[PDB]
Amino acid sequence: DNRIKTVVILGGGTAGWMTAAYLGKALQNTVKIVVLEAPTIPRIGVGEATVPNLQRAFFDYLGIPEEEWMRECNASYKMAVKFINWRTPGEGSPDPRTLDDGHTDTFHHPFGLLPSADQIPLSHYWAAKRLQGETDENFDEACFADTAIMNAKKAPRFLDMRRATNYAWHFDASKVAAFLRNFAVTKQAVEHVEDEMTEVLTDERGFITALRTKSGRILQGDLFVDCSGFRGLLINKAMEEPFIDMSDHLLCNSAVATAVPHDDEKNGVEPYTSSIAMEAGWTWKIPMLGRFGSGHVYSDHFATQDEATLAFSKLWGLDPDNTEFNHVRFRVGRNRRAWVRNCVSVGLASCFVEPLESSGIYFIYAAIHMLAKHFPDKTFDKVLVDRFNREIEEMFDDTRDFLQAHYYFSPRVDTPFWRANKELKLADSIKDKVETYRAGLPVNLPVTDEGTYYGNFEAEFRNFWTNGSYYCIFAGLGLMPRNPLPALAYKPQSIAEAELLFADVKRKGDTLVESLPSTYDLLRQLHGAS
Amino acid sequence: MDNRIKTVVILGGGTAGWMTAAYLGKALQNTVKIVVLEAPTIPRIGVGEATVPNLQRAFFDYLGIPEEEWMRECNASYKMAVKFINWRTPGEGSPDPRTLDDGHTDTFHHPFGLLPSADQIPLSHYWAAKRLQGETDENFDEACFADTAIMNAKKAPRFLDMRRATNYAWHFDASKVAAFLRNFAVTKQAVEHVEDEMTEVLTDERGFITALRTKSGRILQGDLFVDCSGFRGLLINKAMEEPFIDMSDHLLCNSAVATAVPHDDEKNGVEPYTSSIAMEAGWTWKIPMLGRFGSGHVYSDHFATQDEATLAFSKLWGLDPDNTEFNHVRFRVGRNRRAWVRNCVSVGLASCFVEPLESSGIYFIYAAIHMLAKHFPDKTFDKVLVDRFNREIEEMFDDTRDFLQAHYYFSPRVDTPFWRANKELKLADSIKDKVETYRAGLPVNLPVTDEGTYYGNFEAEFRNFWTNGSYYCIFAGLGLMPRNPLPALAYKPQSIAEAELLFADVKRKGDTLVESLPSTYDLLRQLHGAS
Ligand SMILES: N[C@@H](Cc1c[nH]c2ccccc12)C(=O)O
Ligand SMILES: N[C@@H](Cc1c[nH]c2ccccc12)C(=O)O
- State the Cα angle at A353 between A347 and A354, rounded to 5°: 115
- Rounded to whole angstroms, the Cα distance separating A153 from A270 reads 5
Residue A413 touches partner B, C-beta closer than 8 Å: no
Distance CA B200, CA B341 (A): 18
Query: By the 8 A CB rule, do B79 and B151 touch?
Result: no
Please give the distance, rounded to the nearest whole angstrom, from the Cα atom of residue A110 to the centre of ligand 1: 7
User: Are B75 and B528 in contact, with CB atoms under 8 Å apart?
Assistant: yes
- CA–CA distance from A226 to each of A85, A275, A347, A469, B240 (Å)? 38, 30, 8, 32, 58
The catalytic residue among A5, A32, A78, A175 is: A78
Residue A117's beta-bridge partner residues? A120
Neighbours of B44 (CB within 10 A): 12
Say whether residue B446 is in contact with chain A using an 8 A CB cutoff: yes
Closest-approach residue (CA) in chain A for B375: A487
Question: Which of the residues A429, A448, A456 would you substitute to probe the B interface, choosing the one with the greatest number of B C-beta atoms within 10 Å?
Answer: A448
Residue at B307: amino acid letter: D
3-state secondary structure of A463: coil
**Whole-angstrom distance, CA of residue B368 vs CA of residue B358:** 18
Dist. CA B478 → ligand 2 center (Å): 17
Q: Which of B352, B356, B355, B374 is nearest to B365 (CA)?
A: B352
Give the separation between CA A21 and CA A183, rounded to whole angstroms: 7
CB B373 to CB A486 under 8 A?
no
Q: B385 CB near a chain A CB, below 8 Å?
A: yes
Q: How many CB pairs under 8 A join A and B?
A: 113
Alpha-carbon gap: A338 to the closest alpha carbon of chain B (Å)? 18
Q: By residue range, what is the domain housing residue A422?
A: 1-528
B463 Cα–ligand 2 center, Å: 13
Q: How far apart are CA B320 and CA A298, in angstroms?
A: 84
Using an 8 Å Cβ cutoff, are B489 and B126 in contact?
yes
Pairing of strands A281-288, A291-298: antiparallel
Between CA A63 and CA A247 the distance in angstroms is 40
Active site residues of B: 79
Angle at A132 between CA A127 and CA A134, to 5 degrees: 85
| Chain B nearest-CA residue for A495 | B29
> In this structure, which residue's CA is closest to atom 14 in ligand 1?
A111
| Residue B262 amino acid letter | P
**Cβ-Cβ contacts under 8 Å, B487 against chain A:** 3, 375-377, 381, 384
DSSP-derived secondary structure letter, A233:
I
φ/ψ region of B63 (left if φ > 0, alpha if ψ in -120 to 50, else beta) reads alpha
Mutate which of A464, A471, A473 to test ligand 1's pocket (most atoms within 8 Å of Cβ)?
A: A464
Q: In angstroms, what CA-CA distances link B427 with B401, B410, B436?
A: 10, 11, 12
Residues facing residue B486 across a β-bridge = none
Please judge whether A436 and B495 are an interchain contact, meaning their C-beta atoms are less than 8 angstroms apart: no
3-state DSSP call for residue A220? Answer: strand
Contact (Cβ atoms closer than 8 angstroms) between residue A215 and residue A112: no
Q: Is A260 helix (H, G, I), strand (E, B) or coil?
A: strand
The Cβ of residue A421 has, within 10 Å, a number of other Cβ atoms equal to 22
Burial label for B45, CB within 10 Å (0-12, 13-18, 19+), is: middle
Residues with CB under 6 A from ligand 1: A 51-52, 81, 109-111, 357-358, 460, 464, 469
Nearest-CA residue for ligand 2 atom 6 is B112
Say how far apart CA A36 and CA A214 lie, in whole Å. 11
- The residues pairing with B188 across neighbouring beta strands, listed in sequence order, are none
Where does residue B447 rank: exposed (0-12), middle (13-18), buried (19+ CB within 10 A)? buried
Of A26, A438, A486, which has the smallest distance from its Cβ to B376's Cβ? A486
Deposited resolution, Å = 2.0
E strand or H helix that includes residue A95: none
CB-based contact A335:A233 (threshold 8 Å): no
What's the helix, strand, coil split of chain B in %, to 5? 40, 20, 40
The verdict on A487 touching B (C-beta cutoff 8 Å) is: yes
- Nearest neighbour of A28 by CB, restricted to B437, B449, B493: B493
Q: What is the DSSP letter of A341?
A: T
* Proximal ligand: closest to the CA of A167: 1
Q: A210 vs chain B: nearest CA distance in angstroms? A: 22
Non-local CB neighbours of B292 within 8 Å, separated by 6+ positions: B46, B260, B261, B262, B263
| Among candidate residues B344, B338, B390, B39, the one with its CA nearest the CA of residue B222 | B344
Please say whether the dihedral angle defined by the alpha carbons of residues B311, B317, B319 and B324, taken in this order, is positive or negative.
Answer: negative
Euclidean distance between CA atoms A101 and A90, whole angstroms: 19
> DSSP class of residue A163?
B
- Among B62, B381, B384, B494, the strongest candidate for a mutation testing the A interface, having the largest count of A CBs within 10 A, is B384
Other Cβ atoms within 10 Å of A502 Cβ, number: 18
Neighbours of B199 (CB within 10 A): 12
Shortest CA gap A450–chain B (Å): 11
What are the C-alpha distances in Å from A486 to residues A501, B213, B336, B381?
A: 20, 29, 25, 10
A78 is catalytic: yes
Residue nearest atom 9 in ligand 2 by C-alpha distance: B358
A356: nearest Cα among A404, A289, A292: A404
Count of domains observed in chain A: 1
Return the exposure string of A158-179: e unless at least 16 CB atoms fall within 10 Å of the residue's CB, then b. eeeeeebbbbbbbbbbbebbbb
**Per the CB < 8 Å rule, is A30 touching B437?**
no
CA of B449: how far to CAs of B117, B392, B446, B486, in Å?
12, 21, 9, 22
Pairwise CB contact (< 8 Å): B384 & A493? no
Non-local CB neighbours of A110 within 8 Å, separated by 6+ positions: A79, A80, A140, A144, A146, A147, A150, A166, A472
User: CA B106, B108, B113 angle in degrees (round to 5)?
Assistant: 170
B16 among annotated binding-site residues: yes
Using the atom order of ligand 1, give the atom closest to the CA of residue A468.
5
DSSP string covering A18-67 = HHHHHHHHHTTTSSEEEEE-------SS--EE--THHIIIIITTTT--HH
Q: Ligand 2 centre and the CA of B52: distance in Å?
A: 6
